[PDB]
Design a protein around this ligand. Sequence first.
Ligand code: FAD
Ligand code: FAD
Ligand code: NDP
Ligand code: NDP
Ligand code: GCG
Ligand code: GCG
Lengths: 490, 491
Amino acid sequence: SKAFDLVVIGAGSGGLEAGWNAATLYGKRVAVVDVQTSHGPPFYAALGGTCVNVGCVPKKLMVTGAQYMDHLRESAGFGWEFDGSSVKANWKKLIAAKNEAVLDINKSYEGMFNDTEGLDFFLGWGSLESKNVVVVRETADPKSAVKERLQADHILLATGSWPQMPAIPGIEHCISSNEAFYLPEPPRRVLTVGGGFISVEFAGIFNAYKPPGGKVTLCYRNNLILRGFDETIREEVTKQLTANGIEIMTNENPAKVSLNTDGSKHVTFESGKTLDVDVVMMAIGRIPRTNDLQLGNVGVKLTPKGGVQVDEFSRTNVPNIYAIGDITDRLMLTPVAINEGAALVDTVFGNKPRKTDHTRVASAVFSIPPIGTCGLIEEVAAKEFEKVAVYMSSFTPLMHNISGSKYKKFVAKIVTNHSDGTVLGVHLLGDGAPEIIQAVGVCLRLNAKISDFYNTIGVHPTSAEELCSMRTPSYYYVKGEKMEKLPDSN
Amino acid sequence: SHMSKAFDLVVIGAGSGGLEAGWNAATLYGKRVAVVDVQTSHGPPFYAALGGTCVNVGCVPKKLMVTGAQYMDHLRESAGFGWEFDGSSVKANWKKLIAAKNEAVLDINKSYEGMFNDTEGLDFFLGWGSLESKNVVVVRETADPKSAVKERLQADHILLATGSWPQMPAIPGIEHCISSNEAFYLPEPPRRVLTVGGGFISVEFAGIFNAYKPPGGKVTLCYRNNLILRGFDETIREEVTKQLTANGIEIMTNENPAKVSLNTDGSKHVTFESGKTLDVDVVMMAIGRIPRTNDLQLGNVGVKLTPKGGVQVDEFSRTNVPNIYAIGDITDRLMLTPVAINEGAALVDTVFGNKPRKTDHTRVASAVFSIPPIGTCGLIEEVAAKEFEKVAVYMSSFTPLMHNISGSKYKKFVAKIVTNHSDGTVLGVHLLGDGAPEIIQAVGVCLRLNAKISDFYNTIGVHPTSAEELCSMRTPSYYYVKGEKMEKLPD
Ligand SMILES: Cc1cc2nc3c(=O)[nH]c(=O)nc-3n(C[C@H](O)[C@H](O)[C@H](O)COP(=O)(O)OP(=O)(O)OC[C@H]3O[C@@H](n4cnc5c(N)ncnc54)[C@H](O)[C@@H]3O)c2cc1C
Ligand SMILES: Cc1cc2nc3c(=O)[nH]c(=O)nc-3n(C[C@H](O)[C@H](O)[C@H](O)COP(=O)(O)OP(=O)(O)OC[C@H]3O[C@@H](n4cnc5c(N)ncnc54)[C@H](O)[C@@H]3O)c2cc1C
Ligand SMILES: NC(=O)C1=CN([C@@H]2O[C@H](COP(=O)(O)OP(=O)(O)OC[C@H]3O[C@@H](n4cnc5c(N)ncnc54)[C@H](OP(=O)(O)O)[C@@H]3O)[C@@H](O)[C@H]2O)C=CC1
Ligand SMILES: NC(=O)C1=CN([C@@H]2O[C@H](COP(=O)(O)OP(=O)(O)OC[C@H]3O[C@@H](n4cnc5c(N)ncnc54)[C@H](OP(=O)(O)O)[C@@H]3O)[C@@H](O)[C@H]2O)C=CC1
Ligand SMILES: N[C@@H](CCC(=O)N[C@@H](CS)C(=O)NCC(=O)NCCCCNCCCNC(=O)CNC(=O)[C@H](CS)NC(=O)CC[C@H](N)C(=O)O)C(=O)O
Ligand SMILES: N[C@@H](CCC(=O)N[C@@H](CS)C(=O)NCC(=O)NCCCCNCCCNC(=O)CNC(=O)[C@H](CS)NC(=O)CC[C@H](N)C(=O)O)C(=O)O
C-alpha cells in the first residue's frame, strides 16, 4: 500500500529517463516496475529496456563485429599479409562478449536504483487496477498472485513494443530478433523476412558469421526494400548488400513454414516458390505492448493500430495517466522515447510544459553499409512544395580505390525547397553516415539553406565534405513532376 | 620577331588553390588561363606536381597511409568480437602500401592532365615560373633564375599559388634528416624513427610508422615544449598524448635535436640540446612549413612579404602590385587544402566575376588524422575566455560502446562545446576519437548558423553513436568568468 508521486510501468528508455528525472531533478518519490532484472530469455527485455537488452546496444556491438569480415579482406590492399585460410568468425564468442557487456549495463542500472533515494524498483508484471493503483503480479496472467499494490498520484505507461508475427501456418517454427540475439550457432542458411531496419541489420550480421558455404536470404513483399527511405539509397544499399553475398529476394512473402525432421524449415512463398533454411527470422514490424496492462480496468483509449492514444504532451484520455515511447507507436527510436519521457516529467512536475518534436529527427540504419537520414525524402517534399531541388553526389570513397571494395559507393543527397533554398532533408549512405548526420539534425533546427552548406569550408579528405561541395541541383520536382532541368525562369 | 602566348590569367602553382582558380576562371568566366608547375606527376626530384601538395605529398597519400595504419588496430580489436586467425602470420608490408599509394596518386595526376587536354582556354606549362615584370611570367628549365627560358608568357593578371615547403632547422648534420617529402618514398619502413615536432605532420606520421615498423621497432616523437599540439584543445592534447603512448609511440617532451651524425652502420646519432642522445634509422623533421616565395623572383616587381615571409595580401588576396594576387599556403593564413581552394574560388569571383568576395578564415572545421583522430571547429576555451566575459565549457569523455569489448579501453572519445555563456552561442567544438573528422564537418555548418548550446541539446540524438554525445549535454562542466576558470558561477 506504499504511495508514490510517480509510478512507471516499464524500466526502458522512456521509463527510466522519466523516473530518474522525477527523483533527481524534482525530489519526487518514484516506483519503476519491470519483469526481469537482466537480459535474455524468458522475457528478453529487462532493466534498461529493449535498447540495452535486445536492441540498440547488442545490435550495434554485433554489427561492429560483422564489419571485421570487410576489414580483414580490405586490409590486404594496404599491404597487410596473414594466413587467410586460418580466418574463422566465432559466433559463440561474439554472443558471450555481447552478453557480458549487456549484463554490465543491467547491473549498473541496478546500481542506479540502489544509490538513488526516492527511486525504487519492483520486479513483476504491472497493470492498472484503478486510476491511482498500479498492481504488480507474478506473471502476465491477471489471475496470478499479487506482489505489490502501488498507489500513484501519476502513472506512466512505458512498456514499449514487441515483434509482430504474421498468422501463417507454421509461424511457431520462426523466430524474431529476440531469439536471434541468443542463437547457439550461427545459421548456415537464414531467411530474414521484411525489408525494414531489423531485417536489413540482421541480414548483415548473419552474413559475416555464417559458416563456410552458408547463405543469407532477405525477402521483401514489394519491389524495393526500405520503403520510406531515400530511393537512390534504397537502390544502392540493395546493390551493396548483393555485392557482399546477401541474396535480396523481392516481391516474395512466406505463406507457410514446415518443420523438416532434421530441424531445418521448409518455406513456401505466396508465389509457390520454396526455400530450405536453418532459421526463419521474422522482422515485419513491432507493435505496442498494451495487452498486459489491463487497460479496460480504467478505460485508457487505444488507436485503431493498437497504440495508446496520447495528445502532443503524452496525456491519455485519463487524467494522471500518461504514455511515452514505443507504446505510443509514434516514432519507435530510443532517443525519442527518452525526449518524450523527459518532456513529460518537465510538464507534470515542473515550471513549463514541454512537448517532443517528432519532425526532422535524425536516425540511422546500421546496415553494412550504413544509412544516415534526417528530414523529408524527395517524393514527400514534392507534394508539399511546388519547387524541390535535389542535390546528389555518389562517389568511391578515397580508401576504396585500393581496398578492393570497388562496389562501395558513398551517396550524399540534399533535398530543398528550391523557392528559398531551405534544406528539407539530407540522406546518406556509406561508412560514417550515422555519425555525419547527427549535426545535420542540428542544422535543420536552424532554418539551414543549401548555401549554408556549400559556403561552409570542407574538411579534407572525408566523405562528409561532399555535403558542402554541392552547388548545382542534379534535378528538380516542379508541381510533383521529376525533371532534369527547370522549364521556365518562374 | 614573334608574339608570346597571351592569357587573361597566369597561375604559378598547379595545386589546390591554383587549380580551383584556373578551372573556375576558364570554365565559369570564359578566360584564357595558363597554369605552371614543375612536374606533371608525383615524386622525386620535386615531390609536388600537377595537383599540388594535396594530391602528391599531403592529404591524399597521407590519408591512404593512415587508413593502412588503422588495420593494426582492427586486426587486434577483431579478436574481441570473435574473429580468429593465426596471429603469428600477420605482417605489414610497407613496399606494397607505397606501390598502392603511388598508383592511386599517379591516376589522379593523369586525370588532371586530361582535365587540361579537355578544357579549352585552360593550358598547362611545365617548368619553373617567376615574375620577370608586372605582366610577364617566364617559365624556366630549373629553379635557378639563370637557367634557360622555356616560355615567356604575357599575363593580364598573375596568381601566386606555389604553396609551402618543409622548414629544416640549421643544425650540424641536417643533411642526414628527411622531411615528409622523403617519408612518402622510403624504400623500407624504418625500424627506429624520430619524428621531430609536435604538430600535424609529426603526429600523423608517428602513427603511420608505428603500424608499419618491422619487429623490435620503436617510433619516437620529440617535441620542444611540455605538451604536443599547441593551438588545440588542452583536454584533447593530453588525451591524444596518452593514446599515442598506449599504442607504443614514445613521446619525448621538452626535447629538441641540436645535431645529428652518421653512425658507421648508416644509422643516425641524434644529440638533443639537453645532451641526451638517441640512435634511429630515420630522423623526420616536421617542425613547420614555410611559404615558397624564393623561386618567384618577387624583387623584380616589388611584391611585399609579411615579417614572417608570407606574401602580404588584403582580405581579397590582393598583393601591393595591381593585377598580382596570392592565395593558399604562400599567404601563411590557414594552411589547409579547402582553405586554399576557397581562396582561389573567391579571388577569381572578385577579379573576373561580378562579385567581390573574401574567404572567412574563422570557424573553419579541420581534422588531425592521428590515431585516434581529432576534429575541431572554432575557438579553444582559453582563447574564448580572453574575449568573452563569461564562457561555459560542456565536456563529455567516455569509452565508446565497441571498446567495452575490443580490448582497447584506453580509447576514450572526448567531446567539448565551448560557449559564450551570456547568450549560449557556440564558439568552438573539439572532438577526439574515431569518426571525429566526419562528425565535425556538419558542426562547421552549425557554427556558420550561430547555433547555441540549446540547439544542440534540443536536437534528438542518433543512437548508438559517438556524435549523439554533442546533443546530450545541457549543464556546463565549468566556466571562465573574466578569464578565471571555475566550476561554478559565482552566486
Ligand atoms: C532489434 C532492435 C534494434 C534496435 N536498434 C535501435 C537503434 O539502433 N537506435 C534506436 O534509436 N532504436 C533502436 N531500436 C528501437 C528502440 O529499442 C526502442 O524504440 C526503445 O527501446 C523504446 O523504449 P521504450 O521506453 O518505449 O520501451 P522499452 O525500451 O521496450 O522498455 C519497455 C520495458 O517495459 C517492460 N514491460 C513490458 N510490459 C510490462 C509490464 N506489464 N510490467 C512491467 N514491465 C513491462 C519490458 O520488459 C521493457 O523492459 C531497436 C529495436 C530493436 C527490436
Ligand atoms: C604531409 C602533409 C599532409 C597534409 N594533409 C592535409 C589534410 O589532410 N587536410 C588538409 O586540408 N591539408 C593537408 N595538408 C596541407 C595542404 O596540403 C595544403 O594546405 C595545400 O596543398 C595548399 O594548397 P596550395 O595551392 O597553397 O599549394 P600546393 O598544393 O602546395 O601547390 C603549390 C604547387 O606549386 C608548385 N610550384 C612551387 N613553386 C613553383 C614555381 N616557382 N613554378 C611553378 N610551380 C611551382 C609546387 O610544385 C606545387 O604543386 C597537408 C600537407 C602536408 C605536407
Ligand atoms: N537503427 C535503428 O534506429 C533501429 C530502429 N528500430 C525500430 O523498430 C521499428 C520496427 O523494426 P522492423 O521490424 O524492421 O519494422 P519496420 O517497420 O522498419 O519494417 C517492417 C518490414 O516488414 C514489412 N511488413 C510489414 N507488414 C508485413 C506483413 N504483414 N507481411 C510481410 N511483411 C510485412 C514492411 O514492408 P512495407 O514497407 O511493405 O510495409 C517492412 O519492409 C523500426 O521501424 C524502428 O523504428 C529497429 C531496428 C533498428
Ligand atoms: N590533417 C591536416 O589538416 C594536416 C594539415 N597540415 C598543414 O600544414 C601545416 C604544417 O604542418 P607541420 O610541419 O606539422 O607544422 P605545425 O606548425 O603544425 O607544427 C610544427 C611543430 O614543430 C614545432 N616547431 C616550430 N618551430 C620549431 C623549431 N625551430 N624547432 C623545433 N620545433 C619547432 C612547433 O612547436 P610550437 O608549439 O613550439 O610552435 C610544432 O610542434 C600544418 O600546420 C597544417 O596547416 C599538415 C598535415 C596534416
Ligand atoms: N543520453 C545518453 C545516451 C545513452 C543512452 O541512450 N542510454 C539509453 C540506454 S542504452 C537510455 O535509455 N538512456 C535513458 C536513461 O537511462 N535515463 C536515466 C538516466 C538519465 C541520465 N543519466 C545520464 C545520461 C547521459 N549519459 C549516459 O546515459 C551514459 N551512457 C549510457 O547510458 C549508454 C549506456 S548503453 N552508453 C552509450 O550509449 C555509449 C556512448 C555512445 N552513445 C556510444 O554509442 O559509444 C548520452 O548521450 O549521454
Ligand atoms: N569536394 C571534393 C574535394 C577534392 C579536393 O579537395 N581535391 C584537391 C586535391 S587532393 C584539390 O586541390 N582540388 C582543387 C581542384 O582540383 N580544383 C579544380 C577542379 C575542381 C572542379 N571540379 C569539381 C569536381 C570535384 N571533385 C573532385 O575534385 C574529385 N575528387 C578527388 O579526386 C578527391 C581526391 S583529389 N577525392 C576525394 O576527395 C574522395 C572523396 C572524399 N573527399 C573522400 O575523401 O573520400 C571531394 O570531396 O572530392
